[PDB]
mmCIF file of C-alpha atoms in Angstrom:
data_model
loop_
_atom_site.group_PDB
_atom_site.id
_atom_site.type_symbol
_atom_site.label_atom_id
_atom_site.label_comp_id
_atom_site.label_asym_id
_atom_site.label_seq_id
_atom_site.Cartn_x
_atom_site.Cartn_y
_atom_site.Cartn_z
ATOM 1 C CA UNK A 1 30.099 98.831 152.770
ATOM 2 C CA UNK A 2 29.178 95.317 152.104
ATOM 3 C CA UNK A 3 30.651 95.746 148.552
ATOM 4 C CA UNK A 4 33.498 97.919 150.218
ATOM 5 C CA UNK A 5 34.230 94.713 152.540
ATOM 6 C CA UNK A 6 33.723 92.894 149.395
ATOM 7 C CA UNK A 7 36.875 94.367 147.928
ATOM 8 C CA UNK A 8 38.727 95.104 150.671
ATOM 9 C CA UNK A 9 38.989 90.818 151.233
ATOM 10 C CA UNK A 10 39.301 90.680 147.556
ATOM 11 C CA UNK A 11 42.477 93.384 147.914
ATOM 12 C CA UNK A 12 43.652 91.761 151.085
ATOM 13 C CA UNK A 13 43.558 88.648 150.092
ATOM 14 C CA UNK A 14 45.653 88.835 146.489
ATOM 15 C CA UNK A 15 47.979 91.000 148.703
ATOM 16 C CA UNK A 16 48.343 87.705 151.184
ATOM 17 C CA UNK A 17 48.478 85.159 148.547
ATOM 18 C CA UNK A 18 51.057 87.236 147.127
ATOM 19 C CA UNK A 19 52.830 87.747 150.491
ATOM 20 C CA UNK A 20 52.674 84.180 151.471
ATOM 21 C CA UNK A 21 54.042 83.124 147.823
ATOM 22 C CA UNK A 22 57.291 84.815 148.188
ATOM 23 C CA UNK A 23 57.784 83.897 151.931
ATOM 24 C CA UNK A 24 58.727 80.771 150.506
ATOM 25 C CA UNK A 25 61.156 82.131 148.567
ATOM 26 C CA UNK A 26 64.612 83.785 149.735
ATOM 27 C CA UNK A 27 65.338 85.608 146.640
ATOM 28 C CA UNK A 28 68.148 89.031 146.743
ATOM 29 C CA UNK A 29 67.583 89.722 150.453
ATOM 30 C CA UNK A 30 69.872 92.646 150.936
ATOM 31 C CA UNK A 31 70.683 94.966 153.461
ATOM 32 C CA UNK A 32 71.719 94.570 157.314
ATOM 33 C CA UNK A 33 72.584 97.312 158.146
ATOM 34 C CA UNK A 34 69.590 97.916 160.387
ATOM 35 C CA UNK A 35 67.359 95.353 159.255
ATOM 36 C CA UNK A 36 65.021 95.957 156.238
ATOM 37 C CA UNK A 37 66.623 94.784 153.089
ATOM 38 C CA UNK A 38 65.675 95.352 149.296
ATOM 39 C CA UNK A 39 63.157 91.794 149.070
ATOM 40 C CA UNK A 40 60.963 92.565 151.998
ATOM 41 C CA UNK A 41 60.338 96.139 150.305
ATOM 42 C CA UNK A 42 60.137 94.622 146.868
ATOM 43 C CA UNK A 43 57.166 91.946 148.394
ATOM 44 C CA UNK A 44 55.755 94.720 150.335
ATOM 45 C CA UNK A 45 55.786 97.444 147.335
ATOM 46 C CA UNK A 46 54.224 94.802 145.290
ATOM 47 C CA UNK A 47 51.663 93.765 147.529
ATOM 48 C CA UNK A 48 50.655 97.948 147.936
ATOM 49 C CA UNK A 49 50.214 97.763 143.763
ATOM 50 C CA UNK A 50 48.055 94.774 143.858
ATOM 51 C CA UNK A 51 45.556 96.822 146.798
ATOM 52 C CA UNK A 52 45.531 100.099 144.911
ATOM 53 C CA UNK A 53 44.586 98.203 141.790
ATOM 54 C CA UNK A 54 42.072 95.730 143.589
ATOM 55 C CA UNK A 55 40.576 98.799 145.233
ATOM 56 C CA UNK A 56 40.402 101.430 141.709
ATOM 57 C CA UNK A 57 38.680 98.742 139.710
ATOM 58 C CA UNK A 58 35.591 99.348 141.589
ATOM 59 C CA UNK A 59 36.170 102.703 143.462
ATOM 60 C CA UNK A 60 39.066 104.876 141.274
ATOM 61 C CA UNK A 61 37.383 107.584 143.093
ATOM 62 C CA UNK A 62 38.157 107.363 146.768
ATOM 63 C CA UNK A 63 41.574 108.902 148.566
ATOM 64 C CA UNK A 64 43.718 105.462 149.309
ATOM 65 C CA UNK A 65 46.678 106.015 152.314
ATOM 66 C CA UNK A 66 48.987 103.343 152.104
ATOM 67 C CA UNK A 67 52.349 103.051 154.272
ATOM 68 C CA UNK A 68 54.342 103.138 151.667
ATOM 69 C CA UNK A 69 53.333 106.045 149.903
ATOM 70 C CA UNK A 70 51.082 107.971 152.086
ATOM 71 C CA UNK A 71 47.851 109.620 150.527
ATOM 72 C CA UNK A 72 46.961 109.425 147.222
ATOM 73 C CA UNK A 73 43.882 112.065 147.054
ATOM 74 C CA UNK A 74 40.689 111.133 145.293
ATOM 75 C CA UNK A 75 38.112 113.388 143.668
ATOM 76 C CA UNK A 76 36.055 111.953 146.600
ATOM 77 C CA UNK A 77 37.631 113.011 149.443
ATOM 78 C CA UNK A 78 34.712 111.281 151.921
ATOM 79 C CA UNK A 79 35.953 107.819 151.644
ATOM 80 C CA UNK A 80 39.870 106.733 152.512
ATOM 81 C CA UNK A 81 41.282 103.456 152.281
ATOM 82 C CA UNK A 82 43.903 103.626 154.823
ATOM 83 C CA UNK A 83 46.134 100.008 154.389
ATOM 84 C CA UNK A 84 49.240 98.317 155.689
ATOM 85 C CA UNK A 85 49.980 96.063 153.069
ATOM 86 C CA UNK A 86 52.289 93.985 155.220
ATOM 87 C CA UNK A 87 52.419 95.072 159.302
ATOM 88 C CA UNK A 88 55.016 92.937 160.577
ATOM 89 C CA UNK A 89 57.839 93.640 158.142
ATOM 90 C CA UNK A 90 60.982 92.193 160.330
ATOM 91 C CA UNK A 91 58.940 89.365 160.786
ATOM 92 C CA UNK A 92 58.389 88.786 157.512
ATOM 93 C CA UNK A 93 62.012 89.658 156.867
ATOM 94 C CA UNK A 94 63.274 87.036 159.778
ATOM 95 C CA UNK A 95 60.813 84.072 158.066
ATOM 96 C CA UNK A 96 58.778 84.420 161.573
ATOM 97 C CA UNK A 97 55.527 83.277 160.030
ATOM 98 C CA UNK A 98 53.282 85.953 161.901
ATOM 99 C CA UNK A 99 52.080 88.733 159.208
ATOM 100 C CA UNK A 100 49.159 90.719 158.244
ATOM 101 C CA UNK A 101 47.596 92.609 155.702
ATOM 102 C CA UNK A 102 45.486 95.380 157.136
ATOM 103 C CA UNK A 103 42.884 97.670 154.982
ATOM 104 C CA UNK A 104 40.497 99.905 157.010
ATOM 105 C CA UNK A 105 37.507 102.182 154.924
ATOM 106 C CA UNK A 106 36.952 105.446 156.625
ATOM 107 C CA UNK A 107 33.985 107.222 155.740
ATOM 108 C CA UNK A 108 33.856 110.979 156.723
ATOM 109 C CA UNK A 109 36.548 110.195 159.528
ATOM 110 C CA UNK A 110 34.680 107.214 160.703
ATOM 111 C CA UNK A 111 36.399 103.910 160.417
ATOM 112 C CA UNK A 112 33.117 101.449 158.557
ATOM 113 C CA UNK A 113 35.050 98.568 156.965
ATOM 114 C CA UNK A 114 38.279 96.729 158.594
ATOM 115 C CA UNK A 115 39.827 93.736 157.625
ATOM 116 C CA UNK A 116 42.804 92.080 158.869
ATOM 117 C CA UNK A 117 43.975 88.966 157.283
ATOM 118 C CA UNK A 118 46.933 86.223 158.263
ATOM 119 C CA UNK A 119 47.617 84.624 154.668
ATOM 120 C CA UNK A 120 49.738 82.134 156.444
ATOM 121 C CA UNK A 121 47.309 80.833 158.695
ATOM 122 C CA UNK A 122 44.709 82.009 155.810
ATOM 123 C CA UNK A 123 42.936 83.908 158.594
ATOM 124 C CA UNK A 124 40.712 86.727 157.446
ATOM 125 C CA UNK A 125 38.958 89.028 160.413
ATOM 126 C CA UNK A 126 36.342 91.619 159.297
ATOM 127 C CA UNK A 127 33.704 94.190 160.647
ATOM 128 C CA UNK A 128 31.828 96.597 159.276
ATOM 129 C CA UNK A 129 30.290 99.426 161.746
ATOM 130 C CA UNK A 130 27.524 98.584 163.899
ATOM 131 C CA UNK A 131 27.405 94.657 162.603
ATOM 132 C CA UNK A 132 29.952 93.303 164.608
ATOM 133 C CA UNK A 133 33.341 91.266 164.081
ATOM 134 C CA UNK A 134 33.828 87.979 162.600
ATOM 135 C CA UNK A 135 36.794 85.376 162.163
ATOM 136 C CA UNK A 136 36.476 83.451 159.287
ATOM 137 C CA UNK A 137 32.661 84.050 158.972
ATOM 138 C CA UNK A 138 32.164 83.337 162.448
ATOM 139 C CA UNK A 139 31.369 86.210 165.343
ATOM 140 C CA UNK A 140 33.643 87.186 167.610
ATOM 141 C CA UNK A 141 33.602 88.086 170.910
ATOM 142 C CA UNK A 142 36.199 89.564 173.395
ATOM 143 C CA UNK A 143 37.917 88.063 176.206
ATOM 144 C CA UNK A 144 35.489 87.733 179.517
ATOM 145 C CA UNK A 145 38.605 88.368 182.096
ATOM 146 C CA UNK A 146 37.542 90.648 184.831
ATOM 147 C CA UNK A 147 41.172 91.587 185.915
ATOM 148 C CA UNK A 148 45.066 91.476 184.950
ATOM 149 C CA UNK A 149 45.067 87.852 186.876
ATOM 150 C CA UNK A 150 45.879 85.163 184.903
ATOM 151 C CA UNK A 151 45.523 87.260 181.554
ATOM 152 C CA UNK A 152 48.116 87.743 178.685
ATOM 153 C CA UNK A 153 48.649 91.378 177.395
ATOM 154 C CA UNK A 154 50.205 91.600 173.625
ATOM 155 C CA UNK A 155 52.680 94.413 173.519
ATOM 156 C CA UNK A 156 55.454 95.478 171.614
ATOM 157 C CA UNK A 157 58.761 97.296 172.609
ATOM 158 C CA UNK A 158 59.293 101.196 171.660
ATOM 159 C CA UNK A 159 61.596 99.512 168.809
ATOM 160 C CA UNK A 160 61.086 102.883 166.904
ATOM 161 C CA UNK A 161 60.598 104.964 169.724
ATOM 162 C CA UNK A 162 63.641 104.476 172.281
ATOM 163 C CA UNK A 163 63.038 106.986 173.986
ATOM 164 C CA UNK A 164 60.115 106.299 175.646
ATOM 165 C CA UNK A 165 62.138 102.682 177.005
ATOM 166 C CA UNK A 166 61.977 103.275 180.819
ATOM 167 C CA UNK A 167 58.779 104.766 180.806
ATOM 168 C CA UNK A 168 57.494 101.455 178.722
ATOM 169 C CA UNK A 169 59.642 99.527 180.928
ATOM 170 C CA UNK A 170 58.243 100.634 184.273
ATOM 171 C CA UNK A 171 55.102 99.774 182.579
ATOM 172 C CA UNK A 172 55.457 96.533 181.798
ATOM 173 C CA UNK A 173 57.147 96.048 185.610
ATOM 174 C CA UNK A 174 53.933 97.253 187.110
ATOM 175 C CA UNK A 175 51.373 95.196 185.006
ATOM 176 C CA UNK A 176 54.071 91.653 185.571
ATOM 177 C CA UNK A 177 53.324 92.439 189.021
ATOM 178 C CA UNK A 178 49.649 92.138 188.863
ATOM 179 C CA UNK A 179 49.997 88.737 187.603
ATOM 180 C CA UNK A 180 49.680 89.331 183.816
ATOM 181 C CA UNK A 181 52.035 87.376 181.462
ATOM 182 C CA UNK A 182 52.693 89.172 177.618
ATOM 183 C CA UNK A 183 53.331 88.048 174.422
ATOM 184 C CA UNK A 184 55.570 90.028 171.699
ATOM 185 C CA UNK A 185 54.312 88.893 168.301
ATOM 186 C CA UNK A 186 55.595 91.602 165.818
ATOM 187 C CA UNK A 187 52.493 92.608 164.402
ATOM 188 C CA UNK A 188 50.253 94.812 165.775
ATOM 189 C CA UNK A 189 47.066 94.007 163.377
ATOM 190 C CA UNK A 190 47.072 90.831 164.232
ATOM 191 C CA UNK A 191 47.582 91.595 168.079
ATOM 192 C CA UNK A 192 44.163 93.557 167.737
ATOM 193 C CA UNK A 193 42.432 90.995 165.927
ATOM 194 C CA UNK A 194 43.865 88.586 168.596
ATOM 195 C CA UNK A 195 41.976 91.061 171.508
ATOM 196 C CA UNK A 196 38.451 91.229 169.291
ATOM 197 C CA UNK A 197 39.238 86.860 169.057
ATOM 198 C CA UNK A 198 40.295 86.738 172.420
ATOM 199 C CA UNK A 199 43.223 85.102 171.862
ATOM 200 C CA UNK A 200 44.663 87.517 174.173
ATOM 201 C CA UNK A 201 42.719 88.952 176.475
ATOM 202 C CA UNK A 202 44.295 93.275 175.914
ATOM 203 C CA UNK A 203 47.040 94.830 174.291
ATOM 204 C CA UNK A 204 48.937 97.675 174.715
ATOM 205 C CA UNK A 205 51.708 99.783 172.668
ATOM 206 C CA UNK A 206 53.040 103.619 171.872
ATOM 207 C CA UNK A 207 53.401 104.988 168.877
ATOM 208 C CA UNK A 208 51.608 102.898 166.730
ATOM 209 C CA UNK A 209 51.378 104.425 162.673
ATOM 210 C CA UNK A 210 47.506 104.328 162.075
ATOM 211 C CA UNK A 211 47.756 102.123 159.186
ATOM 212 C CA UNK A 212 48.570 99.551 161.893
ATOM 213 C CA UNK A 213 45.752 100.154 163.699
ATOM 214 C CA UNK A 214 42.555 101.805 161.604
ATOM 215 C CA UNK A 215 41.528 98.076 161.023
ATOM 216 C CA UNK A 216 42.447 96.623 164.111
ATOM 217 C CA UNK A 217 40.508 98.873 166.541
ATOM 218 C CA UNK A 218 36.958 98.379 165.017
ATOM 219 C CA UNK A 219 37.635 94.954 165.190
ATOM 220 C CA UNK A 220 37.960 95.334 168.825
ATOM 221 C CA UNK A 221 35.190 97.733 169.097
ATOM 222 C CA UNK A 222 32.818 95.324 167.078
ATOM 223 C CA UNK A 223 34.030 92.637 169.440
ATOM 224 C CA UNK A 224 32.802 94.352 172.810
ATOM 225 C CA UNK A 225 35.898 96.128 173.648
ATOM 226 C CA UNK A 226 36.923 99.393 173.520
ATOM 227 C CA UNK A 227 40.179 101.383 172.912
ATOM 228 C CA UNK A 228 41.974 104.192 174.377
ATOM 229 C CA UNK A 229 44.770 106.845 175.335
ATOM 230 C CA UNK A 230 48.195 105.314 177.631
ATOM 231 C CA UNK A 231 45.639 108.302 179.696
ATOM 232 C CA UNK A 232 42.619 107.288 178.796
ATOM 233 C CA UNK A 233 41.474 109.485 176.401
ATOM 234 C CA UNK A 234 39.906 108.710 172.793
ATOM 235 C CA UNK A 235 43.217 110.543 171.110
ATOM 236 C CA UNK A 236 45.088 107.781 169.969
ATOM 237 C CA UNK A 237 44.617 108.372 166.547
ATOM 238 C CA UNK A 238 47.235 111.349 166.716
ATOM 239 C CA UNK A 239 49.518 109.267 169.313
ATOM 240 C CA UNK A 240 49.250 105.822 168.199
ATOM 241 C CA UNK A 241 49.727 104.927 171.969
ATOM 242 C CA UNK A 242 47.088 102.312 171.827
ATOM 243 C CA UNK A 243 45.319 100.185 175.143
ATOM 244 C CA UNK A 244 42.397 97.680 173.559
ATOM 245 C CA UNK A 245 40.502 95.312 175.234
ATOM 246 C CA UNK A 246 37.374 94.996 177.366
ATOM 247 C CA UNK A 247 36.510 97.733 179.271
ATOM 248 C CA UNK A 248 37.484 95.889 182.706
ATOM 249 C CA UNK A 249 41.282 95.050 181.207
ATOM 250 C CA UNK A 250 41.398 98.296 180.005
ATOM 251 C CA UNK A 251 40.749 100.360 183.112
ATOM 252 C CA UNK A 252 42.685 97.812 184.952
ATOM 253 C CA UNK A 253 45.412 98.852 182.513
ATOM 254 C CA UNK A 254 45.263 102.496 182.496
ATOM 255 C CA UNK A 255 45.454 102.272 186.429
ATOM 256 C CA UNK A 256 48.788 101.073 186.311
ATOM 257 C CA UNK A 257 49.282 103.804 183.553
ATOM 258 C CA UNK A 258 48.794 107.299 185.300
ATOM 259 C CA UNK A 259 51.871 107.262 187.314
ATOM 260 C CA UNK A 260 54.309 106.920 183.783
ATOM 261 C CA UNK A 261 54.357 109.184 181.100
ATOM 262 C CA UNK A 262 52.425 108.311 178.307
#
């Protein structure tokens, strides 16, 4: 737990200083063709190694799910270290310095341990279950807003999802005309963290992988917030179509919801 978070900062850290090490390099980037070339693959592949290896020096037992290579079982099945070793890969790609390693301990389906952590801005964000969220060692609290007025949403565009691009769109058109502004940062980990920080005050995207968000949604939750459905429902683990925020943002959000899709 304690040791868990222990190692999972120990993990998510070499993983950033690796990370931010080669950001500052250029070195063989190649491919275009869509975006994701050979070097962010080779950073990100070699930040996944240094987690698993981190994480089986102290626990070789437990089931690890990475991105990159999806579940590698454990004889004890109870325990999963779900991880994102890099969320925000065209970022990252692009030189846009906003990145995060994400690493989230599940323990009998409940999420325990979550840590998010900018290596650029050598920001770590942690919780464990029932003992709140911190920044740096310090507690965190949510955003106090008490409607869409004057508040900034993060988002991201259904990039990998096109089809759902008017729906999205007609969302964003309805929220813009409540008076919310949005940012678009490219990393949805850190967007979370951002919500439990309130650095933005909610956050909303479809189709989110769960890598991206195991870590970032007990944050939240250990922050005062909550998450939810596009409908309102607590089944975004199998649709990924993530709301966050405070429970005032959020139903303020899923109002302007019902009448879209999903």
């Amino acid at each position: 737990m304690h040791p868990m978070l222990n190692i999972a900062v120990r993990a998510a850290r070499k993983a950033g200083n690796l990370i931010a090490k080669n950001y500052e390099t250029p070195d063989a980037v190649e491919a275009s063709q869509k975006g994701s070339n050979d070097f962010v693959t080779n950073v990100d592949k070699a930040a996944e190694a240094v987690i698993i290896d981190t994480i089986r020096k102290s626990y070789p037992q437990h089931t690890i799910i990475t991105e990159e290579s999806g579940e590698l079982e454990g004889t004890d099945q109870d325990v999963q270290w779900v991880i994102d070793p890099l969320d925000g890969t065209t970022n990252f790609i692009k030189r846009l310095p906003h990145f995060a390693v994400s690493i989230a301990v599940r323990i009998k389906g409940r999420t325990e341990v979550a840590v998010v952590y900018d290596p650029m801005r050598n920001e770590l964000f942690t919780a464990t279950r029932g003992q709140g969220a911190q920044l740096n060692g310090y507690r965190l609290r949510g955003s106090t807003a008490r409607d869409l007025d004057g508040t900034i949403l993060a988002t991201g565009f259904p990039f990998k999802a096109k089809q759902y691009a008017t729906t999205y769109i007609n969302i964003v058109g309805k929220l813009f005309n409540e008076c919310a502004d949005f940012r678009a940062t490219g990393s949805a980990a850190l967007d979370l963290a951002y919500v439990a920080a309130g650095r933005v005050d909610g956050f909303f995207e479809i189709g989110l992988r769960p890598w991206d968000f195991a870590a970032g949604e007990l944050l939240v939750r250990e922050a005062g917030g909550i998450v939810s459905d596009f409908t309102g429902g607590h089944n975004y683990m199998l649709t990924g179509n993530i709301v966050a925020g405070n429970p005032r943002v959020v139903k303020a959000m899923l109002a302007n919801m019902r009448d879209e899709l999903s």
